[PDB]
């Protein structure tokens, strides 16, 4: 019904530490002839879920580093690919991908799985999205780690979480041009600049989804949707705040990509006030926006801090 198509295989080949076996769901309610790809990792068996959500212009092999430490903690890791990312299906039309659109498919994952227990671990669309997951069955979920990311609400009710659109011109402005601009978006150059220290194979693992242009309507939506929030995203995003501040009973753990233009120290610090009884953020001075390529720290410090109360 949606016009969708699929990245190739063979793409896929040569990943650089990406060892991780694929799982695949074509049959969500709502989301008929699209597959999804997410990776199960660990035991199957465990207690604790940790639901790995990546953002733009990425997918699960965002969370390669991560992985690993949740899985030797005894915890099951589902980190699936959102369409028109990764290894799952693409919807070509970029009307087509909406806020709902994703978040529906987030539930219905989470109910085709039955996931309980679960450890939400998020970093922009992915908390963008994520965030709003809690209040709409809260039983399911426990813990939190976040990274920069926060609630697509409007100006008025929170302007740290609108003003990094328009200001600096070398932080959310200039990510949106170079997304949405370019007739010809190379994955790989976009994110040596966005992410510096990666290595060129690792850059070169991010383009790997999307052969030609007629793959990246997904990518090209999702920065739109930060800049133009329909009412229902707004309306969403502003009750989850209220889930948060007053609801929210589980265990958080912040952690803040300090050179971030987009997302950093003045979009977590309020995000941390939002969410009743998060700690003192771990700061990491040299990571930027993707805080997940200096994942490992995030990973064990997070645990160390869950394990003090458990
Ligand atoms: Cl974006």
Redesign the pocket.
């Known amino acids: 019904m949606i016009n969708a198509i699929r990245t190739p295989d063979q793409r896929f080949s040569n990943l650089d530490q990406y060892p991780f076996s694929p799982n695949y769901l074509d049959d969500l309610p709502g989301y008929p002839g699209l597959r999804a790809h997410y990776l199960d990792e660990g035991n199957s068996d465990a207690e604790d879920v940790f639901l790995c959500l990546h953002?733009?212009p990425t997918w699960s092999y965002l969370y390669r580093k991560m992985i690993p430490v949740f899985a030797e903690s005894g915890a099951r890791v589902i980190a699936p690919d959102f369409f028109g990312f990764g290894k799952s299906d693409k919807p070509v039309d970029e009307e087509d991908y909406t806020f709902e659109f994703h978040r529906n498919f987030l539930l219905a994952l989470i109910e085709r799985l039955d996931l309980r227990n679960i450890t939400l671990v998020v970093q922009?669309?992915g908390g963008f999205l994520g965030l709003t997951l809690p209040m709409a069955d809260p039983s399911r979920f426990k813990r939190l780690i976040i990274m920069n990311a926060c609630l697509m609400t409007d100006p008025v009710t929170q302007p740290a979480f609108s003003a990094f659109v328009t200001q600096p011109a070398d932080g959310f402005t200039a990510?949106?041009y170079d997304?949405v601009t370019p007739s010809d978006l190379r994955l790989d150059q976009f994110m040596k600049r966005w992410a510096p220290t990666l290595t060129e194979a690792e850059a070169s693992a991010y383009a790997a989804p999307f052969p030609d242009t007629s793959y990246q309507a997904g990518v090209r939506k999702?920065?739109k949707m930060?800049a133009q929030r329909d009412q229902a995203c707004i309306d969403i995003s502003t009750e989850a705040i209220s889930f948060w501040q007053n609801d929210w009973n589980g265990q958080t753990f912040m952690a803040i990509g300090m050179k971030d233009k987009l997302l950093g120290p003045d979009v977590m610090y309020p995000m941390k006030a939002l969410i009743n009884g998060c700690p003192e953020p771990l700061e990491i001075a040299d990571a930027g926006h993707f805080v997940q390529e200096f994942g490992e720290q995030v990973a064990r410090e997070a645990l160390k801090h869950f394990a003090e109360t458990e």
């Open positions: 953002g733009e922009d669309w990510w949106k997304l999702f920065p930060v």
